[PDB]
Amino acid sequence: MRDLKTYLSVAPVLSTLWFGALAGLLIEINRFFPDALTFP
Amino acid sequence: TYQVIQPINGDPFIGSLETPITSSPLIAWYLSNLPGYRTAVDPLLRGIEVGLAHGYLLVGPFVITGPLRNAPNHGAVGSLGAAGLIVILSITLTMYGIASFKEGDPSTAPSLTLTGRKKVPDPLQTADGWARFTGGFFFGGISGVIWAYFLLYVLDLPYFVK
Amino acid sequence: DISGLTPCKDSKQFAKREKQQIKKLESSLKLYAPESAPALALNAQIEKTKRRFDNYGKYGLLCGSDGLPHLIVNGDQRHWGEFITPGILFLYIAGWIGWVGRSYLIAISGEKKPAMKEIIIDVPLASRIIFRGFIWPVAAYREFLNGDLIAKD
Amino acid sequence: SHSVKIYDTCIGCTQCVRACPTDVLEMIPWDGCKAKQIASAPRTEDCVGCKRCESACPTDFLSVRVYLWHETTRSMGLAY
Amino acid sequence: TPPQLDPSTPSPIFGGSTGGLLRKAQEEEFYVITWESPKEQVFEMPTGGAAIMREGPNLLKLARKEQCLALGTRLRSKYKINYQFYRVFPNGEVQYLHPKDGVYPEKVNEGRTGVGVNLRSIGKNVNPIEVKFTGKQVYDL
Amino acid sequence: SVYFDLEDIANTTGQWDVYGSDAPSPYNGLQSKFFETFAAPFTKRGLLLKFLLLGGGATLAFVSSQATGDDLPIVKGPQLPPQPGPRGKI
Amino acid sequence: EVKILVDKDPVKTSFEEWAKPGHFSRTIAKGPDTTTWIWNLHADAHDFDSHTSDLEEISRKVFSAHFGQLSIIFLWLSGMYFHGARFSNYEAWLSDPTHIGPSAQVVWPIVGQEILNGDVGGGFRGIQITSGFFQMWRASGITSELQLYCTAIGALIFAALMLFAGWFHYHKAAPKLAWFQDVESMLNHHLAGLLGLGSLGWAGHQVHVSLPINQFLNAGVDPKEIPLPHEFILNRDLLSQLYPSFAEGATPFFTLNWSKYAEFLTFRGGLDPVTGGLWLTDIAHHHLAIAILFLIAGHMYRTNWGIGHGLKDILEAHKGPFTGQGHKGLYEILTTSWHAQLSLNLAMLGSLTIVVAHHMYSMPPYPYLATDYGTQLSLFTHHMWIGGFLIVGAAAHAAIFMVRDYDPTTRYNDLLDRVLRHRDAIISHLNWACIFLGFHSFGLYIHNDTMSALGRPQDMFSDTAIQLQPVFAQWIQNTHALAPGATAPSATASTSLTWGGGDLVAVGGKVALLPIPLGTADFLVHHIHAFTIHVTVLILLKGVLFARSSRLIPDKANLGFRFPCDGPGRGGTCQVSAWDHVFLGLFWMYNSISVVIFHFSWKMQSDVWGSISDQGVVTHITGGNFAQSSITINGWLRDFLWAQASQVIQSYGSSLSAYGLFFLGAHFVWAFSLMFLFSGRGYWQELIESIVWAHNKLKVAPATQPRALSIVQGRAVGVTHYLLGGIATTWAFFLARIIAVG
């Protein structure tokens, strides 16, 4: 349990989780606010 | 059992091996009877033979594959090209001889046979010997080119490919 | 307008581009039943294109002699929404990231083997640090005055 | 022949000598270090310049330095 | 130590290879490594292949000093055999090389004088302009 | 049993003449006399190099200068009216 | 004696070693000091023989890794079947395979990417696929989307099974070393058990599920009214109408009247005119014969009873006057070295993949595969690349065996010893052969280019000029075309339409196959192929043979298999390790395979593929321009590279727009690789020294000290990016061209 939490804190796993969350956020923003060239 | 491949001359620490390609009696005799390995005879005659063979062999490609191959003058043009190649080869031989051999130095050829018997080293590896060899080569090559031309386009013998 | 450009609500090339895009989309509509799902999907694309062009008209963008929007960066007060405001937002996010990274690197520096917290991240410590970037300009300024920002070697 | 030089930052752990592929270096008595020995290069004519000694040098900076110089048949590793 | 001379001892059993001596040994030099073995055994050759070392004296001729030293270190590490090697010239001159003092060079020994030892740190070498238009190098000073 | 002798370095290092033959001349005496007589001028390496280079250069220049339009298209020259340029240039 | 030998609970299942990166090696387990550690962890992950010296421990690891790989492959197959069942137009393609393009991928409507859902036909929008799964599914008799869903579920279950098997055999029941070294039993089981029984089962499926459903499909009946496969087993009457011989049951099989089964077991040759592929009745008989052959083959070796052969006995009895003791000692080498077995298997598999690629285009086995040009080109190129990579890996692992596991004192072999005793002769002869082939192959192209540029078309090497006819290949073609009449009397047609039987098969107004003519241009490309193959062989064989030692480095074995150099001494000793030789040979393998696939593409588009009208006239894609244009480098530059790239460069704004983007990306990556290939790490470490100062000035310097990539790692990165960019450029260009124009 402790060892598995230590493994999930390793660089590649944390990196893929973080970038997946970022990609999902950006994708949803672009889905609901598409084609933004300026900032109104 | 019975192995065929042996170390060269019985010495396992010389960088070669004895194989049927290199040490069979037929190939050994054939190589020993070529003009390039006739140690005890004037290099001029050996060069004559070598040039006679090579200039004769050089005529065909120039005559048949050349730019003017389809012209009625193809034979003479190809023979002239072969003669020019022989001249260039003689120039290269003279250059190598001048660069490699000094007039006073003795021969660089080995003085032992395969059986360890002392022999006279080849005079071809001297300045005078090489000069005689290249002169003979030039004279033989020009004559061979002329002979091939005479056989092909002066007597017009029914050769299949001309 | 600026640099000889005309607003995209006036330029005829912009409207011609919008008409040609819709015509290109409507040619593939002919190959499907009027009630099919591909016909419903190309119609959504047509509405998306109409909304895009209408928005580009409304925001007040300048278009060249090609019918395409052109950005104005020099600092004009009526074109701040193309470079200045997005740039400020980017500079706020990037400074946030940099400051959270710097604080985490400082926090693990004084340990026995600090290279193990750089490949296996102390997630609770990162959670503590992360939300300090919301006020990163204030702290970054304040360590400039005191002298805790730059190492004087 | 390349040039091999030894500086007094030597600690005399003999690492260069046993890394020599052509027996160029050796160890000689000394008094400037705790080991009471320093390296020497009396046979640089057999040097090939592979710089294996510098890879075995623990001192910072290197205590044995190899400078590539005039090339001979021995220094180019030619067997023909 | 008085260096040992070169007898006519036998050679390891080998079938021959194309990696042996070339004409450089005829005109420039070659090398001879001699050792003593307690039993007949297999050993890899530095020129490729495996040979049989005989019990008693063993003599082997090679093209380079590096080959001789590589074979010697392999013998010392694997078979625990002491070795020597010499340089032989076309005129029959033999030059004893290693072990030069009778002691291997990684072991300190009296009677050796330092060659190429600089009594300074590597950072105290002078700049090139100080040796410009002279024939000397900065590390030779 | 041994292949290392200090008195015989040539045998030790393999300085052998493998295919060299010490047999007498296999050529006929009259033919050898003829070739010796008529190839003697070409046995001077200093003279041969100069003669070959200079005579070959002169022969090459002469043959190139005597070539006709049938042998070389470059000697024949153009036979067709010239093409015009992209925008009326000649 | 041959028996199951296992060890119980050898390794405890715990998460403790997951939290300790680098646990598998002594050096890496201590943690990182610089960034090099991070790379060293990934480079040594699967180097099992470097982790431990125990052969049994290594063997158990490879045994479990194979189970993991099998689980991954099963997951991939399950995904393919699920996407065929859920996101494909397979059921519409079944009713009109000549006018509908296969598609099994549909993209989401985000950021405008929904343009990639093109009009593939059948009321479907998606991405056209070139894997050939639709034709294989049609051949297998698959008719509905439900049977693909069940296959996906079964593949998922099998993937779970393989994963559990790997865990169980590494942690619960680990086989002993003696179990792995039972090579006779393994060979017997893989020959008779795996291959023989697998082919027998597939033959049964073909004669029971494939033949009837495909007979219904080729007759022109709707797929939705074909009886289900089990209906052909339940009432045999349905099977006794297509083939009345089934009414006899298995009596003809047991009474040795096999000609009674001639209805569905045939020896025809050629192609099915309705389908354009091999006759299914031929394929079923092929598999049934292969099953018997392999079942008999798998009974050759002795395991526990007296009958059978001993592999060591066979090996030790093959020796002669030129090879000394012969093959004695090879059994010990091949039963104690994983790397030698890996090398041999990689070479054989890579060679077999190329044969598969060559045979699949000339004898299309699947229905409606020949007239789907995009699938054919993609399959050929894919299998060529796979074969080349496996062949290169064979040389790499042979070099690894030479460096590590070679030991003449305990594992001597006369053949390997004698090969190492004349390696100079081998390498010099291969060098001469490479130079001769390079001249007499490529310099002919330069001669042709110069003659064409000089206004002398009559002096070139061409069919209207000096000819170089491949007379031997022409004779082989003529011999194979006459086989049905004299040398294969029971065969009706030749094994391929390309031999020259003077017939062409057309399906849907499209040419499937026709006699392929050979001329001077083919003579040129074939010798070009031979030259590149010889150069790759030279590079790899020189690395394998000179890995342990050379005249430059007498002790190259002590430096390892993968080292950068041995210093600037001896004039310079860069890239002397066996690893570098593989690194260099990858480029030449890439060159050779690129030339082969370019040859295939141009020849197929010029002389085979095309369209046929209802008059009898054939019009090829490029109109037979290969013979007169593929003889100059300018011809390849203009009529192939420039002419056929016009598709991928005008694909913007269409469904093929993803191939132009990949075209540019591949060019970018290929150019990017040259930074790594042309430079060295000494410059980059010094450059990093200045950036580290800037970070230290702002107190943001990491504890893990930044290091430039190692000398060997930079070469690996450069070659990987080079290969990726090069292969992706052709992938995009080929796919765009053959989808737009094919």
Ligand code: CLA
């Ligand atoms: C703590 C993170 C951090 C910070 C504060 C900086 C800060 C700086 N870097 Mg830098 N850098 C970083 C990480 C960081 N870097 C990493 C990870 C790399 C390797 C890819 C580099 C590679 C790099 C180069 C090659 C150069 C700089 C340069 C610079 C300076 C100019 C700004 C610049 O060019 O940014 C550009 C920054 C990058 C290209 C890298 C950004 C990488 C990501 C965004 C950082 C992520 C940090 C970490 C993962 C998050 C921490 C999470 C934690 C809470 C658990 C500036 C002092 C330049 C310089 O010295 O000129 C003055 C320069 O030439 N950096």
Ligand code: CLA
């Ligand atoms: C090699 C096998 C393979 C491949 C290449 C694909 C590829 C694809 N499948 Mg697929 N599939 C497969 C096997 C495969 N599948 C199998 C075996 C099944 C049966 C179970 C399916 C069932 C299936 C369905 C049912 C669907 C797909 C879909 C898709 C497509 C979109 C996938 C996607 O966006 O992921 C979705 C994204 C993720 C799964 C996220 C990635 C997760 C990683 C670990 C990162 C996690 C970070 C996370 C996202 C951040 C938030 C975390 C949280 C803590 C904050 C894509 C082409 C979809 C499609 O084509 O739509 C039209 C679709 O609907 N597949």
Ligand code: CLA
């Ligand atoms: C049930 C869970 C479980 C647990 C707790 C362990 C625990 C352990 N195993 Mg074990 N193992 C398991 C399941 C498990 N295993 C299964 C199912 C298999 C069969 C494949 C194996 C096969 C196996 C072998 C062969 C070995 C171990 C070893 C070990 C030990 C250290 C391994 C380690 O650090 O893993 C951390 C490593 C990982 C988490 C890597 C997992 C990578 C997966 C399997 C492959 C997926 C990659 C895929 C291609 C990704 C593609 C996308 C990418 C491009 C982004 C440890 C005691 C090793 C040992 O004893 O140490 C000496 C050892 O040699 N195990």
Ligand code: CLA
């Ligand atoms: C008829 C018996 C039989 C069969 C069918 C196989 C089949 C296979 N063996 Mg194998 N093997 C056998 C007997 C058999 N072996 C014996 C007797 C020995 C000891 C001498 C070995 C020792 C052995 C080793 C050391 C290795 C294999 C491997 C493999 C796989 C090669 C990969 C492949 O072709 O994928 C084909 C894939 C399929 C056909 C998919 C279906 C999977 C099959 C049906 C499962 C096999 C079940 C097995 C025979 C018995 C299960 C035990 C039972 C208690 C459940 C393949 C699944 C290699 C491998 O990948 O390991 C995992 C490997 O490294 N075998």
Ligand code: CLA
């Ligand atoms: C079944 C085949 C097979 C097997 C079992 C092995 C197994 C092995 N090889 Mg090997 N090899 C193979 C095929 C195989 N190889 C082939 C075909 C080649 C020729 C290319 C090589 C070339 C090769 C070399 C040159 C070396 C090995 C080495 C090794 C050993 C260490 C492997 C390791 O730790 O890698 C760790 C794995 C990685 C570091 C991952 C690398 C990721 C690659 C480079 C990216 C591939 C690109 C990808 C497909 C595209 C992704 C796109 C991206 C945007 C996501 C191991 C025993 C090494 C060794 O020391 O052996 C003892 C070694 O030096 N092999």
Ligand code: CLA
């Ligand atoms: C287009 C670029 C190019 C070319 C022409 C070559 C050429 C060659 N490489 Mg190569 N190479 C290249 C790029 C290239 N390489 C790159 C990028 C790499 C890095 C991966 C390598 C890596 C590499 C390795 C690792 C090896 C080679 C080898 C070879 C040689 C193969 C033998 C051969 O074909 O000789 C024939 C010569 C040619 C085809 C050259 C063209 C000659 C034509 C006919 C014109 C000549 C006319 C005339 C002589 C001009 C005289 C005029 C006068 C005024 C001078 C040959 C010299 C191998 C080798 O040396 O084996 C012998 C080898 O092992 N190369």
